[PDB]
Design an enzyme around this catalytic site. Sequence first.
Site, PDB file in Angstrom:
ATOM      1  N   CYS A  24       0.818  -1.208   0.000  1.00 36.35           N
ATOM      2  CA  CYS A  24       0.000   0.000   0.000  1.00 36.35           C
ATOM      3  C   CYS A  24       0.855   1.262   0.000  1.00 36.35           C
ATOM      4  O   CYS A  24       0.415   2.302  -0.499  1.00 36.35           O
ATOM      5  CB  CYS A  24      -0.943  -0.006   1.205  1.00 36.35           C
ATOM      6  SG  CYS A  24      -2.008  -1.466   1.318  1.00 36.35           S
ATOM      7  N   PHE A  25       2.066   1.193   0.550  1.00 37.06           N
ATOM      8  CA  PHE A  25       2.990   2.320   0.548  1.00 37.06           C
ATOM      9  C   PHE A  25       4.099   2.176  -0.485  1.00 37.06           C
ATOM     10  O   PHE A  25       4.979   3.042  -0.549  1.00 37.06           O
ATOM     11  CB  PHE A  25       3.632   2.505   1.930  1.00 37.06           C
ATOM     12  CG  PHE A  25       2.704   2.257   3.085  1.00 37.06           C
ATOM     13  CD1 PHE A  25       1.419   2.776   3.096  1.00 37.06           C
ATOM     14  CD2 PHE A  25       3.132   1.520   4.180  1.00 37.06           C
ATOM     15  CE1 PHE A  25       0.577   2.549   4.169  1.00 37.06           C
ATOM     16  CE2 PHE A  25       2.294   1.292   5.255  1.00 37.06           C
ATOM     17  CZ  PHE A  25       1.016   1.808   5.249  1.00 37.06           C
TER      18      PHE A  25
END
EC number: 2.3.2.26
Lengths: 384, 75
Positions: free
Chosen positions: A351-352
């Site tokens: 997600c990052f």
Amino acid sequence: GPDFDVKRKYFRQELERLDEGLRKEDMAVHVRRDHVFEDSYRELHRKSPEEMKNRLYIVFEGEEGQDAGGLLREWYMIISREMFNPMYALFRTSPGDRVTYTINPSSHCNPNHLSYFKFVGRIVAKAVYDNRLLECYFTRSFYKHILGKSVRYTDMESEDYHFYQGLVYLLENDVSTLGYDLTFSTEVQEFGVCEVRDLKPNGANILVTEENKKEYVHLVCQMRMTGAIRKQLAAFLEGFYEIIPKRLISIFTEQELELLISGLPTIDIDDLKSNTEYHKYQSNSIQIQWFWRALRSFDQADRAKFLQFVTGTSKVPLQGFAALEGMNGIQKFQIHRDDRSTDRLPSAHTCFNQLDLPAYESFEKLRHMLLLAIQECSEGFGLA
Amino acid sequence: MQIFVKTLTGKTITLEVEPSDTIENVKAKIQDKEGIPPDQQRLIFAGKQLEDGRTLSDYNIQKESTLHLVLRLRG
């Protein structure tokens, strides 16, 4: 390039004009990884078109992964690969250098295939609506159907290169020179003995001669590329157009439409390197120097697995690695040093777009640890 | 007794274990054969995740059984 950006600016702007007045909500999708196509079909094929424009978040059964963006990217990738699994008889492989897919004419193998084709078209349109990428590659014929362009017999070169170059020879030469016979019909390979479909009224009883061979070449390509899959195309485009209007998608070319769905055709490590951030390491720290050296030593197949490892998808967004998307807005690829232990494999938070890299003690160990992780854990979320 | 641990790519790891061995012991024998710390390993058999405290006999893992190894690396 720039002309592509001009179209996409207009394309996305008109898409957002059409959902003005939509109270969008987060919509859960509960699927099992080994049944991702069947489970997503059960969870989404009866949603309204307005419901499909909600923000999807994925819950993989039995997996700690929490979808802040990375799970949805992987979901799009693995569902796009399972739609073309020949075990579903929905699609087949077009014979050629690069592998693309064709609608399977024997798709009534699956009795509910028309329901699945509308769902497949919905997913492709949903991926474009979400600005997410798929591992789909279609023929020039298929892209022309989505763009509303008329299919010509020259488009057969992309669908079947050798069959097409058998047609040029028939046009170029005399039928007295072929050594075989041709009629105005084409084969139905539905596991039957010499079952054929007519290209013309009573076409199976009409021989192909020099007087009518041009008509045969025209008729056989319209059949191979649209007639034989008429109902499946209509079902696909119905689901596709429910989300992306035909008037909007048809501004693109076939090559532009392919890039819109699949992203950039290659993974540029140099572009990734100039758009990387580091936390606890520095651009010149020894493990970072070893990392880029290892990444460059990977073939195109292994650098795809690496992209999946840290971002969730093997595909590159159209604006390059400078536009890598995270939770809220843009989050470039980032590498954090893992201080817990140097015997751990590298870890990632898709997600990052973050890679947790331990401070390995040799280039050989780093390369081995990195390749082991991306090959034996290219997919699957065992962490939150 | 010989069991097989299958990885994501399909590679097979053959181990020499006994039915009284704990799942934690099997994860340690994988660490010596593949260099993966046990806290990053998850073992699957018959669609069930194996807890570290249980033995192989507690999961009815007999001879020539095949386990599945998934890594806990991505969130």
